[PDB]
Amino acid sequence: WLGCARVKEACGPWEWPCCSGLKCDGSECHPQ
């Protein structure tokens, strides 16, 4: 239990849950 991805972490649709307000903009979570 650490937290969530950041605005520079690799995420996806259901592979890595990012924090609230960050959407996978292609591959790296972005600041919306």
Swiss-Prot record:
Subcellular location: Secreted
Disulfide bonds: C4-C19, C11-C24, C18-C29
Gene Ontology MF terms: toxin activity
Source taxon at top rank: Eukaryota
Tissue: Expressed by the venom gland.
Record key words, sorted: Disulfide bond, Knottin, Neurotoxin, Secreted, Toxin
GO cellular component terms given for this protein: extracellular region
Family: Belongs to the neurotoxin 14 (magi-1) family. To aptotoxin III.
UniProt free text on domains: The presence of a 'disulfide through disulfide knot' structurally defines this protein as a knottin.
Function: Is both paralytic and lethal, when injected into lepidopteran larvae. Is a slower acting toxin, being lethal at 24 hours, but not paralytic at 1 hour post-injection.
Protein name: U3-cyrtautoxin-As1a
Organism: Apomastus schlingeri
